[PDB]
Chain A
Amino acid sequence: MRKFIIVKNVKVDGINAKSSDITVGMPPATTFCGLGETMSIKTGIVVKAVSYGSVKFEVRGSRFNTSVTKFAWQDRGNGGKANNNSPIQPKPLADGVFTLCFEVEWEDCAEVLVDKVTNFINTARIAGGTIASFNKPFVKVAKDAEELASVKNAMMPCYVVVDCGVEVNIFEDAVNRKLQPMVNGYKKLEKIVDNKHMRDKFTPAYLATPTYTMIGYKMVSNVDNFDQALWQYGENTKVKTIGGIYN
């Protein structure tokens, strides 16, 4: 027995489009799983999965180059060079209207759940982008599978993410089978021995290289199983769909 809260038409601008070194565009499912665990921390409603779809999404720039951001002189000790233009590190920006659907388990009324999600989203930040606007979130429940599809079709219109898996690698199949690659998680390289320059000193830290899976965009109504669009934190330091690989 499943419960969901849907925030439709989440207009967000200033999204850090740099998903990884080789992916620029839509934020991956690690971003929205991070947003889900962020509310698990601030609001206390513990979130299993998030199904996110893109209503609108434009990467700022041309069709072959992204619009770089005019950097500001914010480091310490480079005064004197501040009159000249700051050097640009690559961070593409994008705008996106999203539709989010969080699997939550809740025991109180739907009004306080909607208010808690609204108070989170008013202080949230989708992929480094300020949430410009969002409709009032609404609670829908998936008692059975037809009710699961009711929740699924309540995200209309949006293009959700379905996992199609890795055959050999990322570049090969992106040309061959023409699917989109995105960060489904990370791979740990080395333990980090210096916790002085970090957010926490006690949380263990690892250098990571983003693993990618290959995904497709399908409209939420054309997705047969809603579990193939709900991304959640898998126990391989990755994220994964509940329904597995989309067929």
Chain B
Amino acid sequence: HKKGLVEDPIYRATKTMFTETLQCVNVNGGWFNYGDNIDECYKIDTSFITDTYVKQLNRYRKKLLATKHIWFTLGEDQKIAILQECRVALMLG
């Protein structure tokens, strides 16, 4: 829905890599609006366990499992552009 926003000046000064910047993306960058009903916001039911959802999750997870070996052979520039394409397709869907 929206990208995380980093207010931190040292993090904005230094962070460059993919995960090394992503570890600085916290809940306070827009997601944590006011925070008084957090315990109700994290008590969760598990009614998704159905037939077609579980097989779709399994087939896509194994697809990722089989292709993630080429992901580590990518460069920083690739990872950023590929994940931008993935985010654009995800909001499209």
Contact = CB atoms under 8 A, between A and B. Distances in A.
A109 B13 contact: no
B56 interface: no
Contacts of A1: 13-14
B8 A110 contact: yes
Q: Size class of B's contact patch? A: under 10
Interface string A102-133: 00001111110100000000000000000000
A107 B9 contact: no
Given A109-B8, A110-B8, A141 B13 contact: yes
A108 B13 contact: no
Interface string A125-150: 00000000000000111010000000
Contacts of B12: 141
B11 interface: yes
B24 A3 contact: no
Q: Size class of A's contact patch? A: 10 to 19
Interface in B22-66: 24
B10 to A, nearest CB: 5
A45 to B, nearest CB: 11
A92 B24 CA distance: 49
A106 to B, nearest CB: 5
A108 B9 contact: no
Contacts of A111: 8
A183 to B, nearest CB: 32
Contact of A140 (B9, B11, B24): B9
A149 to B, nearest CB: 15
Contacts of B8: 109-111, 139
Contacts of B13: 1, 3, 141, 143
Nearest to A4: B9
Contacts of A141: 9-10, 12-13
Nearest to A140: B9
A20 to B, nearest CB: 37
A234 B84 CA distance: 47
B3 to A, nearest CB: 19
A108 B14 CA distance: 9
B24 A107 contact: no
Contacts of A3: 9-10, 13
Interface of B: 8-14, 24
Interface of A: 1, 3, 106-111, 113, 139-141, 143
In order of increasing CB-CB distance, the 4 nearest A-B pairs are A141-B13, A141-B9, A139-B9, A106-B10
